[PDB]
Amino acid sequence: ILVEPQKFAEELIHRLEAVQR
């Protein structure tokens, strides 16, 4: 869907932190 930058970036940041060594 068409997500606003803030919400999208938050989800992406949360996910990247989990797959980070």
Next chain:
Amino acid sequence: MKVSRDSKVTTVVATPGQGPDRPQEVSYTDTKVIGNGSFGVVYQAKLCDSGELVAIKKVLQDKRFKNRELQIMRKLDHCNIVRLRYFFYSSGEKKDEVYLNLVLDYVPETVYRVARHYSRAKQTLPVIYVKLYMYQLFRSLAYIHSFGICHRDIKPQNLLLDPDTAVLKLCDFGSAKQLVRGEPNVSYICSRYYRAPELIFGATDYTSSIDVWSAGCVLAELLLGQPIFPGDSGVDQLVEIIKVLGTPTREQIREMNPNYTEFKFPQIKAHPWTKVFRPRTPPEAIALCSRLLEYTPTARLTPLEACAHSFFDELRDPNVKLPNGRDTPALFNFTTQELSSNPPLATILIPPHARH
């Protein structure tokens, strides 16, 4: 639309794809559904005159508005793009509703179904086929992009195959659009696994280079045996991309969508391409793949440049042949319009023996 019998025979007055509107009587038979969906239905049929098989794509049409897919396909005439023979209007299951019928060349296989076989068989698609298919894809992309047309839905399912001649034909232009600088577009375009990162970031000012990214995804999938960037959501898919390419730099993010430059994303180390693919993977395939799957849209190779890549050197060998014994299809019959973006590539793209 009329019904006769000589077996059921359907007769309609359909307009040819090329030239001025000069509709002819067209008769066909042996109709059967070879595809259903939310778009409409796809029938196979046999032309009465020629006996040639055709695919009839039937979609719902608002007569007050012009059909974008039709207007685009009528302009296209290329050996690696499915041909629009005729088109006509008719009625269907919905009352008081008019349908658009697209009569296209029937092509038995798709790149998806073929690759899917090798996956089931736990084998890998031979490199020669990868070269052949990808070359013809970029060739078709070079053509449509010269008209400023972007497909916006490049995926294995949309790459038709003739298994006997190894000819690839790009199809499904229901998402295609004339991209014009200054006039923004929908970012919800393109299907899962093959969406460019800028599209995922909701960019609206993207270019035809999104197709090149999709092509890179297709190339990677052929070498891998499975999609390289799977995932249901946009975030899911971006995670996969980052897990391979590493976290995009601020400048790369700016190139895709400036609205994301200020967010601090965790820095993920990139995974070397040589570790992403099997150890038997050809170096030039890997090299080509990395030049297609770039974060920065303008950094990606153009379709024409991709054709000139060293990975397709074997296809320019005069003594090249398909595994089934016969010769390779037409690969060097480039036109001026096709070479419009970069003419000096002709010295590479057209080998000396092809000029004979």
